[PDB]
């Protein structure tokens, strides 16, 4: 039965070369963004379209808090930037909307932002697309951005409840059979379709979870080549970096990107 060091030796030895990563809220709480006053009837209303059409301000408040400049990526994000720079990253699937994967300098072509992005926006009425800078001034100024043609509300391309996942989500059809290593960081992947995706890699493919606890389909339906590195996600990432011999590259990358 496989340990963290075995996975590290697989990666070091390049016997693992096409890593598919899935990430959630647990990688972003170390940047100071919590998981899960706002003038909301219940939590989920912030991402429901009917509530939004009736009162778009609470969402726009969250958007202002999440625009670039409030948070910075942490060692977790930079570890993933490192996999990319070392030619190991096939795709990174994220449930986060903080954009820190792309901020950490992972290219868009490597990202599936499965819950969408603030980088672009769409008129809710005529479906015209707009770069997210175009509404930036309005959000920063607590104004509801309006379509310059139909007056419709222009909403950032955050996926709301009941909306299809983005088109790029389709890449899962090719990435998951192609994966030779599955890395899950900071999420349990409790809900569909993320749950079944852990089940879509080939039986011979190690699945490595760095997470608070052993939960989700790794707990429910284990396979022989699974590894759990339980506890603090930052500590787990650091142990893995440390077994890979990437300590110096972590430090180089972090100080290049963030000053120190």
């Amino acid at each position: 039965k496989l340990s963290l060091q075995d996975v590290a030796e697989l990666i070091r030895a390049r016997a693992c070369q096409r890593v598919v990563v899935m990430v959630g809220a647990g990688i972003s709480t170390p940047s100071g963004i919590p998981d899960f006053q706002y003038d909301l009837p219940y939590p989920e209303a912030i991402f429901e379209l009917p509530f939004f059409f009736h009162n778009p301000k609470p969402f726009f408040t969250l958007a202002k808090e999440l625009y670039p400049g409030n948070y910075k990526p942490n060692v977790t994000h930079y570890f993933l930037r490192l996999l990319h720079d070392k030619g190991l990253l096939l795709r990174l699937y994220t449930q986060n909307i903080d954009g820190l994967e792309r901020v950490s300098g992972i290219p868009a072509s490597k990202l599936v932002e499965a819950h969408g992005t603030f980088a672009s926006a769409t008129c809710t009425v005529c479906q015209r697309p707009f770069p997210g800078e175009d509404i930036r001034a309005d959000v920063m100024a607590d104004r509801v951005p309006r379509c310059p043609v139909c007056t419709g509300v222009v909403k950032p391309d955050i996926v709301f409840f009941g909306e299809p996942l983005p088109q790029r989500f389709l890449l899962h059809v090719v990435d998951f059979p192609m994966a030779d290593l599955l890395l899950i960081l900071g999420t349990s992947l409790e809900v569909e379709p993320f749950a079944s995706l852990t089940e879509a890699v080939r039986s011979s493919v190690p699945r490595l979870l760095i997470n608070r606890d052993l939960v989700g389909p790794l707990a429910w339906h284990p396979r022989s080549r699974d590894v759990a590195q339980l506890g603090d996600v930052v500590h787990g990432v650091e142990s893995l970096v440390e077994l890979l011999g990437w300590t110096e590259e972590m430090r180089d990358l972090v100080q290049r990107e963030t000053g120190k």
Binding site: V159, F161, G162, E163, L165, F169, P193
Partner: peptide, 4 residues
Amino acid sequence: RHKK
């Protein structure tokens, strides 16, 4: 098919 796949929705949030």
